[PDB]
Amino acid sequence: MRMFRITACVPSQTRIRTQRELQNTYFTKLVPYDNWFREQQRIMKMGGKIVKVELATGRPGTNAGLA
Amino acid sequence: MQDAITAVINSADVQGKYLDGAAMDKLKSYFASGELRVRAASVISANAATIVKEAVAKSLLYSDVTRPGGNMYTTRRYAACIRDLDYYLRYATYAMLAGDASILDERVLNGLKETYNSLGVPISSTVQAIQAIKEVTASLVGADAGKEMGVYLDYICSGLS
Amino acid sequence: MQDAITAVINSADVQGKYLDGAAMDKLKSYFASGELRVRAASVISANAATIVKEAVAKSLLYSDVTRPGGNMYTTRRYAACIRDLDYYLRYATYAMLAGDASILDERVLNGLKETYNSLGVPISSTVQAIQAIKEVTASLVGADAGKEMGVYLDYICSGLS
Amino acid sequence: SIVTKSIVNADAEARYLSPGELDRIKAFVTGGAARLRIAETLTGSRETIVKQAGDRLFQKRPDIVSPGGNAYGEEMTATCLRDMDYYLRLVTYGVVSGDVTPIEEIGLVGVREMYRSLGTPIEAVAQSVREMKEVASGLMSSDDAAEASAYFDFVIGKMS
Amino acid sequence: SVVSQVILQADDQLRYPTSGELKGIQAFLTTGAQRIRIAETLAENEKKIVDQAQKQLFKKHPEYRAPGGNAYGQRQYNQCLRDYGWYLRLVTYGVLAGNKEPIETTGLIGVKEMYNSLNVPVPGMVDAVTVLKDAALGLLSAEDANETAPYFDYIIQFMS
Amino acid sequence: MRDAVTTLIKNYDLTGRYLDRNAMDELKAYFESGSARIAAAAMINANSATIVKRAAAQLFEEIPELIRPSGNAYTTRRFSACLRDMDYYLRYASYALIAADNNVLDERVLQGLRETYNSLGVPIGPTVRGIQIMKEMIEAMAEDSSLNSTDFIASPFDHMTRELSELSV
Amino acid sequence: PSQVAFASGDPIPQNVARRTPGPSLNRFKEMARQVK
Amino acid sequence: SVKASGGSSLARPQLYQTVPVSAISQAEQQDRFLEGSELNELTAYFQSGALRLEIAETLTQNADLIVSRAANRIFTGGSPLSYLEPIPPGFRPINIARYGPSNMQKSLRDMSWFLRYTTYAIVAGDPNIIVVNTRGLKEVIENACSIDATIVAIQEMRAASADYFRNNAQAKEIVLQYFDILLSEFKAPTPANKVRQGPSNDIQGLELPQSYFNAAAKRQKYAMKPGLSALEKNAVIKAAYRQIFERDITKAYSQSISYLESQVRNGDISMKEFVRRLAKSPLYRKQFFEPFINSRALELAFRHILGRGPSSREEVQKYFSIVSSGGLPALVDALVDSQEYADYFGEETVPYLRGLGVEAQECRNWGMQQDLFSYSAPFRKVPQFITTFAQYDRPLPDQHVYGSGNDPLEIQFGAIFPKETRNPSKRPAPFNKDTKRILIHRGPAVNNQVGNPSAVGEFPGSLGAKVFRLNGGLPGAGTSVKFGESSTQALIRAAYRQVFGRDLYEGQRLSVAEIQLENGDISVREFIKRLAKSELFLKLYWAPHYVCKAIEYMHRRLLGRPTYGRQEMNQYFDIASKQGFYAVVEAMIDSKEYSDAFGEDTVPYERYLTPGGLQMRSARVGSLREDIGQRVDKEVTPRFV
Ligand SMILES: *[C@@H](C)[C@H]1/C(=C/c2[nH]c(/C=C3N=C(/C=C4\NC(=O)C(CC)=C4C)C(C)=C\3CCC(=O)O)c(CCC(=O)O)c2C)NC(=O)[C@@H]1C
Ligand SMILES: *[C@@H](C)[C@H]1/C(=C/c2[nH]c(/C=C3N=C(/C=C4\NC(=O)C(CC)=C4C)C(C)=C\3CCC(=O)O)c(CCC(=O)O)c2C)NC(=O)[C@@H]1C
Ligand SMILES: *[C@@H](C)[C@H]1/C(=C/c2[nH]c(/C=C3N=C(/C=C4\NC(=O)C(CC)=C4C)C(C)=C\3CCC(=O)O)c(CCC(=O)O)c2C)NC(=O)[C@@H]1C
Ligand SMILES: *[C@H](C)[C@H]1/C(=C/c2[nH]c(/C=C3N=C(/C=C4\NC(=O)C(CC)=C4C)C(C)=C\3CCC(=O)O)c(CCC(=O)O)c2C)NC(=O)[C@@H]1C
Ligand SMILES: *[C@H](C)[C@H]1/C(=C/c2[nH]c(/C=C3N=C(/C=C4\NC(=O)C(CC)=C4C)C(C)=C\3CCC(=O)O)c(CCC(=O)O)c2C)NC(=O)[C@@H]1C
Ligand SMILES: *[C@H](C)[C@H]1/C(=C/c2[nH]c(/C=C3N=C(/C=C4\NC(=O)C(CC)=C4C)C(C)=C\3CCC(=O)O)c(CCC(=O)O)c2C)NC(=O)[C@@H]1C
Numbered sequence A: 001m002r003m004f005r006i007t008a009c010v011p012s013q014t015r016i017r018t019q020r021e022l023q024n025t026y027f028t029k030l031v032p033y034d035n036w037f038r039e040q041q042r043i044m045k046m047g048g049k050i051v052k053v054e055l056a057t058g059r060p061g062t063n064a065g066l067a
Numbered sequence B, C: 001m002q003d004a005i006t007a008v009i010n011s012a013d014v015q016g017k018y019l020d021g022a023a024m025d026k027l028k029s030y031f032a033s034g035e036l037r038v039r040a041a042s043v044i045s046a047n048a049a050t051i052v053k054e055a056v057a058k059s060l061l062y063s064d065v066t067r068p069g070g071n072m073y074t075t076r077r078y079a080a081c082i083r084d085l086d087y088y089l090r091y092a093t094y095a096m097l098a099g100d101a102s103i104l105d106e107r108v109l110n111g112l113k114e115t116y117n118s119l120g121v122p123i124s125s126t127v128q129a130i131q132a133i134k135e136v137t138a139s140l141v142g143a144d145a146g147k148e149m150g151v152y153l154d155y156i157c158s159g160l161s
Numbered sequence D: 001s002i003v004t005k006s007i008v009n010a011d012a013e014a015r016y017l018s019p020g021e022l023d024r025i026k027a028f029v030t031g032g033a034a035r036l037r038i039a040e041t042l043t044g045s046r047e048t049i050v051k052q053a054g055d056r057l058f059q060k061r062p063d064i065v066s067p068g069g070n071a072y073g074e075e076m077t078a079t080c081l082r083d084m085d086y087y088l089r090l091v092t093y094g095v096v097s098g099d100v101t102p103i104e105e106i107g108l109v110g111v112r113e114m115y116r117s118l119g120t121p122i123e124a125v126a127q128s129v130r131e132m133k134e135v136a137s138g139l140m141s142s143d144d145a146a147e148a149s150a151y152f153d154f155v156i157g158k159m160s
Numbered sequence E: 001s002v003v004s005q006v007i008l009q010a011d012d013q014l015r016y017p018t019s020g021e022l023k024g025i026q027a028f029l030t031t032g033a034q035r036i037r038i039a040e041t042l043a044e045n046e047k048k049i050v051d052q053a054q055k056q057l058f059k060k061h062p063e064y065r066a067p068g069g070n071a072y073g074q075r076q077y078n079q080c081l082r083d084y085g086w087y088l089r090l091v092t093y094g095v096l097a098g099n100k101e102p103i104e105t106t107g108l109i110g111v112k113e114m115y116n117s118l119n120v121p122v123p124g125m126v127d128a129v130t131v132l133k134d135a136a137l138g139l140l141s142a143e144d145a146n147e148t149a150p151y152f153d154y155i156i157q158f159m160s
Numbered sequence F: 001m002r003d004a005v006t007t008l009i010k011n012y013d014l015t016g017r018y019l020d021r022n023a024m025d026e027l028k029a030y031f032e033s034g035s036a037r038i039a040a041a042a043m044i045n046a047n048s049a050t051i052v053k054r055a056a057a058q059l060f061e062e063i064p065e066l067i068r069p070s071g072n073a074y075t076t077r078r079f080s081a082c083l084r085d086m087d088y089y090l091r092y093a094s095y096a097l098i099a100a101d102n103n104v105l106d107e108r109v110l111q112g113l114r115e116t117y118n119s120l121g122v123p124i125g126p127t128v129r130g131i132q133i134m135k136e137m138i139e140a141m142a143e144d145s146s147l148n149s150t151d152f153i154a155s156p157f158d159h160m161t162r163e164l165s166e167l168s169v
Numbered sequence G: 001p002s003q004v005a006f007a008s009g010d011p012i013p014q015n016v017a018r019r020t021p022g023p024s025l026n027r028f029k030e031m032a033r034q035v036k
Numbered sequence H: 001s002v003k004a005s006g007g008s009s010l011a012r013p014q015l016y017q018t019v020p021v022s023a024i025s026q027a028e029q030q031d032r033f034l035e036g037s038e039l040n041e042l043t044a045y046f047q048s049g050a051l052r053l054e055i056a057e058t059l060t061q062n063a064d065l066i067v068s069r070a071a072n073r074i075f076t077g078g079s080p081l082s083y084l085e086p087i088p089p090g091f092r093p094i095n096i097a098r099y100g101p102s103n104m105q106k107s108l109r110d111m112s113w114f115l116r117y118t119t120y121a122i123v124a125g126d127p128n129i130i131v132v133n134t135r136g137l138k139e140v141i142e143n144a145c146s147i148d149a150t151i152v153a154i155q156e157m158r159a160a161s162a163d164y165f166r167n168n169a170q171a172k173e174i175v176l177q178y179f180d181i182l183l184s185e186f187k188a189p190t191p192a193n194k195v196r197q198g199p200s201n202d203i204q205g206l207e208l209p210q211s212y213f214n215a216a217a218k219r220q221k222y223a224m225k226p227g228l229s230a231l232e233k234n235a236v237i238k239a240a241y242r243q244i245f246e247r248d249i250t251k252a253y254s255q256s257i258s259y260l261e262s263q264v265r266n267g268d269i270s271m272k273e274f275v276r277r278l279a280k281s282p283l284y285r286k287q288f289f290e291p292f293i294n295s296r297a298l299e300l301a302f303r304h305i306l307g308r309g310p311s312s313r314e315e316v317q318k319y320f321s322i323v324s325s326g327g328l329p330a331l332v333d334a335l336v337d338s339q340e341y342a343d344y345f346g347e348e349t350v351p352y353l354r355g356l357g358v359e360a361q362e363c364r365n366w367g368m369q370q371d372l373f374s375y376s377a378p379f380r381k382v383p384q385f386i387t388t389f390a391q392y393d394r395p396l397p398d399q400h401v402y403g404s405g406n407d408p409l410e411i412q413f414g415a416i417f418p419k420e421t422r423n424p425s426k427r428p429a430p431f432n433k434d435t436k437r438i439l440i441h442r443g444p445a446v447n448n449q450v451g452n453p454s455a456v457g458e459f460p461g462s463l464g465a466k467v468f469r470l471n472g473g474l475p476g477a478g479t480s481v482k483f484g485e486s487s488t489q490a491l492i493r494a495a496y497r498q499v500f501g502r503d504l505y506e507g508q509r510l511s512v513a514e515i516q517l518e519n520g521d522i523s524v525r526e527f528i529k530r531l532a533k534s535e536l537f538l539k540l541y542w543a544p545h546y547v548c549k550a551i552e553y554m555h556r557r558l559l560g561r562p563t564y565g566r567q568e569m570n571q572y573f574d575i576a577s578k579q580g581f582y583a584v585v586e587a588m589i590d591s592k593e594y595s596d597a598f599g600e601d602t603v604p605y606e607r608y609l610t611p612g613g614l615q616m617r618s619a620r621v622g623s624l625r626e627d628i629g630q631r632v633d634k635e636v637t638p639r640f641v
């Protein structure tokens, strides 16, 4: 499967949390290709700042043999 | 219940059409097989006790089912099981004579699973015993009449699964 | 779920017994019919939408069910009925391949009657729909596969009834 | 209610309302005004009715408010007057409905079992209702009093 | 009458009749003068009422008197006139009684069974009763006609 | 079964309340409407058979499939049963009109009605349309006659229509 | 002997016709007759 | 709307009688094989079948000509055949132009329909269809159709149909007899409806058209009389046992009360007294009283003694009071001595199941009586009439939208649902698409997201479940004794316990996902998604269940709450229809509410309960608080101390 490696910064609106929240804020994680559109929308519409997107696993221009 | 004539007539009537060629074909097949189906039913009725005895001997006796802790263990449970076998034979005969399994739907498979799942009767053992009944009847009535009864006994068996 | 092979294996394993000759011949029976089941399943998989369409068109269209006030009125409910029919056809094919109705009893029928009585889905009309599916499939896959698919569609109907 | 009785009778016979049932419903509808007047009187005078009836009951039946009696003590006496208020409310319900059905349904089915469970002498409850009937009858005209006394008497008869 | 109905309802529950049932009994027993005068007025005018009704019906259904018809023949025609009169008598009975019981026990229960056995069409009978209703109410005051119409309506409803 | 007075009394007994001014006003409204309700019931009694027949005829004219093969009014058996059901609805609607309360319809008509029609394959929608046809006929009849109050007439029929019909929105 | 086979015999498919617009579409049918 | 459902099962009234159905039902209602009588009827009918099909063929082929002869004799002034879809004194031909196109269409349709149903009756070997659909057609069409004209048309059709059968007195006689039945039945007046009056004021009165009764299967009626032969008395007693005990326990188990049978067959006791004493017997007590609570026992007793289920709330109330007071003897005496019993069965007739086709049926107890009449009724232990009748009078219950069976136990692990067939307990209720289920928050009540939608994610503290978060850093984000190994592993095992309920056996854990989580490559959300989509989850919790049961359990595990109603259920179920299990999991974990309640670092947890689950947990003796549901009296030392 294609896997992106997305880096994002998520700010905190509507709440001043007192527990540890740094892990949720600026995170780098592997995302399956199929979920990246939905995840991009979710991070954006939450107020996030997607710094970086790369194709960690997979190739461009691949018509077959992606799963 | 509905027999074959009712099924054909209702199919014709719901469309407002007279009895057509295919309807007449199926009806004449029913009427032509009727005499041999009646003879098979008579033979089965004359041998119901022996049929159930032999099927029980083949499939159920001398197994975990009849020993202490088995669902057929006590005398009441044994008698109830052979009575159920008689039910299955009788209603297979009804379905054969009617040329349709509607009697099995409305008078047998209605809450058969309710009854057996509530009482914890073993379904696999029942299916094995019904298969034994089918084999015994086929040996007694003939291969072709055996198949004619076997469609309905298999119908009950698949209803049990 | 259990298929015919798993039915034999479970019957042997609950007693701790290796497979004897009778179990072997039951497995031989299942292997004998497996080609038929694969071909019938292929035809039905190719034509599923068309069986459903023709069965709806022959049983439910231009009736009170689709007119204003019927349970198939409005597009959401129409799509719901077609969706249910897709499930019934697909699970009937699954069971037919397996040779056992167990998947129907567990995925389809265990809760569906309560579901339909809760939602107010009419069971007479849906049984008519599944019967129409039965005849359409019987027309497509032939005599033997038609009867085998029959068995499991009738099973769904009896579970609903 | 009278209307409900007529309707359920007609339904039991699987027929439309007969002329007699329509006549009875017409009588009920026409007597609505007087029934409402009686109910208005009973509701408006509920406090004085209950106080006077309870006074007459206690002075006539001191044992129930004497030590060892069921209604002994300030709180038990308060609860007894509360029960009297309950039954007066039910009487007003029966008056407006034109029938004893609400009284039966709310306050007389199983009343014996309840009061046996509580240890309350039921005959004294009947006497409390009698006192309430006597007090209420003085507050209205003779025909109105006669109409209300029937509901009071139904309660009394069910009590004892 | 309503008294018998009240007693039947009370006995079925093994109790004395409630206050509402007795009040209905009182209202019925007070309207007796109107019921009696209606019964008398319908009594002496039987001939005119029946004549108007029968001419109206056989204008509505000339086939009944036509050859092959149920009323064709003087005997059958006279029997039909007899039936008109008998049902008017039943209506007077019902008016006096205050309910439909005298009508229903005498000439409605099994009426379809009877007339089917005689090949007199039941729809012919309901049309006959409708015209008899019109003729009879024509000979009554407005209030008396309003009082006595629902009995004719009840016979009509039972007939079909 | 609950009529308007019983419904009011139940509401007030739930809270242990004596009847107040609003209760007396509602009872007064029912009692003053009683004469009109009785007149409407009597008019229905005078025309029930013809009302049912004409409503059925109109329904089968509006939905001709009902009396054609595979229609649920097809064959005299089903046709007679359908006219019987219409008679049921009219009789219980008359009851509800007199009681000024639709609980009689809930208890003795609607509860389990969907289940029965689903079991038999009786189509609900045409039955609801027939109920509405009978309602319109009753309303026109009441308008024609010398009746003063006729707004209550629609209440039972509409109730049945809302209680039995499928939810579309 | 083989004549006994009815349910075990070769199935005889029955003709069931696809349903078509009933009289409830009559007005639209007229409109269809006047849309060409 | 209606607040409860008694269930709905497929109903199959008989439309008409046929010879095989007649014979087979005659044998089957008596619980026996077909004997010489029924088998001989079947033989004769099958023999006549070829001739009957010949008649049907010739009539369907020439139906056009027969109908044309009828239409030409009946109509005058035009061609009736322009559109196809002995003489009474009053007969006169009808004018096509005057009579009208609609009525002409109905005339031609009716003639063809008469011929068609005549052929149907010929094939069926019974005129019952003709009688059923023709007795009372006259009154249906008098006012728009001439009866004399119809009679003449039927006579012409009869003559033309019989004209094709000069063969011999085999075809001609059958055709003539069936047409004569049609003629006499069209000439028949409408019979009165069968009235089933309410036995009391709590039960409505009903009526049934006689044609409906004529079509339905006739209930065999057994009456004990002194003069019956011994074999007939045996049949009657067997019927009594089949009615009271639901099957022939004498045939099955040799169970019998001999002295009662001798008394009833001698006439010492009536069949009513025999029923009374049999239903009081220890046999009946052991079979249909001891196994059941009184509430279910009285419903079964109504089946056995009256042939019907309870009709109303008042009736079940009254009879439950009776059985509470005097037990089984009081119940049996009340039922047998009821006016209803004597009205139907009297002194001699064995009670019979009434049900559909025998008399007008009520809607209020339709489904419950359908269930009660099944032979599986003894295995329903939960009362069905009191429950459904009470639920009519009350708002919608706390229950899954698709039924009670779709509610799993709210236990730590396991997907335990009631099985529809095992000890049937189904409680259908009409939830429309917009209902919302009231859920109890596991935490501060005011944090329930219904009243406080921004409370979503507010951890419940001591009032709710423990919450596992990857708050601490992950290891290696060399050295040993790095403390960040215990927290991450505790969270991994917590996630396993959340998705699956309990920890897996050795070799089952998704080790690759665990290392990929421990290396910061994924988030907690991604890991639980992998767990939920695992083949192990599919096999355990998706595959073995009804689709909506699987979805409901999934929702509880992943979102920490049951579904609110039809909106969520329908969307997940539709995804299940279209895409499948992995897509359903995706939808649940990618939903907005998951993000709000659980971020990328929180293991899901139980956030809400149904009332039933909370009651299960907190209503037991050892967990029930002292102040809940009772009066708490303050204890004070006596003043005299
Ligand atoms: C000597 C005692 C007589 C005799 C006996 C006999 N019995 C069988 C077979 C069975 N007997 C039973 C009986 C019971 N099982 C129970 O659970 C109970 C109650 C505790 C009883 C009484 C059963 C169930 C069987 C079936 C065998 C099995 O265990 O599965 C046989 C064999 C008959 C045959 O042909 O197989 C015999 C010989 N036979 C006589 O002639 C003696 C008078
Ligand atoms: C042998 C077949 C298996 C077996 C049977 C068994 N059955 C029961 C009990 C009952 N079986 C039924 C079934 C029916 N009754 C009907 O009227 C019909 C429709 C035609 C059917 C299918 C019923 C209702 C009962 C209980 C009530 C009754 O007696 O009728 C038992 C007894 C169970 C108990 O624990 O008491 C048994 C033993 N058991 C096996 O192990 C065999 C595989
Ligand atoms: C045609 C088949 C008939 C018909 C169908 C119909 N069904 C619904 C709604 C639902 N059907 C289901 C079905 C299932 N649940 C399961 O778990 C399974 C899998 C084994 C099945 C088959 C469900 C869950 C629903 C409810 C969905 C929802 O939440 O909305 C409808 C719509 C009913 C409504 O009120 O929207 C319809 C129309 N109806 C007919 O009249 C046909 C005879
Ligand atoms: C205060 C002296 C200065 C200042 C602060 C400021 N901080 C933020 C936002 C965040 N700060 C953190 C830091 C931490 N969170 C943790 O959990 C820990 C580790 C234990 C640390 C050190 C984080 C993660 C954020 C973002 C997420 C969140 O706030 O919940 C802001 C930005 C506010 C905003 O919403 O844009 C500010 C203002 N700013 C100054 O000017 C001061 C000099
Ligand atoms: C016209 C613009 C297009 C077209 C139409 C067409 N429709 C059908 C058949 C049906 N149409 C519906 C639609 C609805 N039913 C509803 O309840 C609603 C919601 C309010 C709608 C819109 C249905 C259900 C049917 C099925 C038949 C029935 O009513 O029972 C047809 C006939 C299809 C067939 O073969 O039966 C046609 C022709 N066709 C076009 O080409 C246009 C684009
Ligand atoms: C009159 C000379 C001719 C005629 C016309 C006619 N029929 C109707 C109405 C109905 N006809 C039927 C018929 C049948 N019901 C059945 O079950 C069968 C098989 C035995 C038949 C043939 C029915 C059910 C109706 C009522 C519903 C409907 O309109 O279809 C009318 C209209 C009556 C009206 O009052 O509007 C007319 C004019 N029928 C004859 O037999 C004559 C040849």
Ligand SMILES: *[C@H](C)[C@H]1/C(=C/c2[nH]c(/C=C3N=C(/C=C4\NC(=O)C(CC)=C4C)C(C)=C\3CCC(=O)O)c(CCC(=O)O)c2C)NC(=O)[C@@H]1C
Pocket: F066, F071, F072, F073, F074, F077, F078, F079, F081, F082, F083, F085, F086, F088, F092, F108, F109, F110, F113, F116, F120, F122, F123, F124, F126, F127, F130, H013, H206, H207, H208, H212, H356, H359, H360, H361, H362, H363
């Ligand atoms: C006429 C507008 C529609 C129609 C009707 C139809 N109904 C039935 C059968 C039954 N109808 C009922 C209904 C009730 N029973 C009650 O007690 C009450 C409450 C007061 C109601 C509303 C019932 C229970 C039945 C079955 C039992 C019986 O016949 O008494 C039929 C016959 C169904 C069949 O073929 O078996 C018909 C035709 N049909 C239409 O097409 C109209 C929409």
Ligand SMILES: *[C@H](C)[C@H]1/C(=C/c2[nH]c(/C=C3N=C(/C=C4\NC(=O)C(CC)=C4C)C(C)=C\3CCC(=O)O)c(CCC(=O)O)c2C)NC(=O)[C@@H]1C
Pocket: H258, H259, H260, H261, H262, H263, H265, H266
């Ligand atoms: C045997 C010594 C003689 C004999 C007996 C005989 N009796 C009957 C019939 C009946 N016997 C009774 C008696 C009782 N039934 C009871 O329940 C009890 C009370 C505990 C008693 C004493 C009855 C009531 C009958 C009639 C009903 C029945 O058959 O059970 C018969 C049969 C008569 C018949 O015509 O069928 C016989 C043969 N007959 C002799 O010849 C012996 C001298």
Ligand SMILES: *[C@H](C)[C@H]1/C(=C/c2[nH]c(/C=C3N=C(/C=C4\NC(=O)C(CC)=C4C)C(C)=C\3CCC(=O)O)c(CCC(=O)O)c2C)NC(=O)[C@@H]1C
Pocket: H293, H294, H295, H296, H313, H316, H317, H318, H320, H386
């Ligand atoms: C008392 C401590 C609590 C209480 C009780 C209560 N119960 C009812 C009504 C019923 N209770 C039953 C019970 C049973 N059915 C059985 O078969 C058995 C097993 C032996 C039992 C115990 C039934 C069937 C009813 C319904 C009776 C009826 O039909 O009316 C009520 C009245 C409910 C009503 O609506 O009338 C009450 C009050 N209630 C409390 O608040 C106490 C905590």
Ligand SMILES: *[C@H](C)[C@H]1/C(=C/c2[nH]c(/C=C3N=C(/C=C4\NC(=O)C(CC)=C4C)C(C)=C\3CCC(=O)O)c(CCC(=O)O)c2C)NC(=O)[C@@H]1C
Pocket: H411, H412, H413, H414, H415
């Ligand atoms: C051991 C002494 C006996 C035994 C046990 C046994 N249990 C199961 C299956 C399950 N056990 C549970 C139990 C619980 N779930 C909870 O939430 C709680 C509290 C924390 C308990 C105690 C559940 C829910 C199941 C089913 C789900 C699951 O197993 O994960 C089995 C296996 C049954 C099967 O095949 O499903 C067994 C064997 N069996 C015996 O014979 C001993 C007497």
Ligand SMILES: *[C@H](C)[C@H]1/C(=C/c2[nH]c(/C=C3N=C(/C=C4\NC(=O)C(CC)=C4C)C(C)=C\3CCC(=O)O)c(CCC(=O)O)c2C)NC(=O)[C@@H]1C
Pocket: H438, H439, H440, H441, H444, H445, H446, H448, H450
């Ligand atoms: C106040 C007049 C009385 C009272 C109330 C009380 N309620 C609770 C707890 C809950 N209340 C609800 C109710 C609803 N939730 C909904 O969504 C709706 C529909 C709009 C309603 C009506 C619920 C679900 C709860 C459970 C917690 C939660 O909110 O999720 C309590 C607390 C009970 C406890 O033990 O904590 C109380 C006190 N109590 C009284 O004594 C008053 C008479």
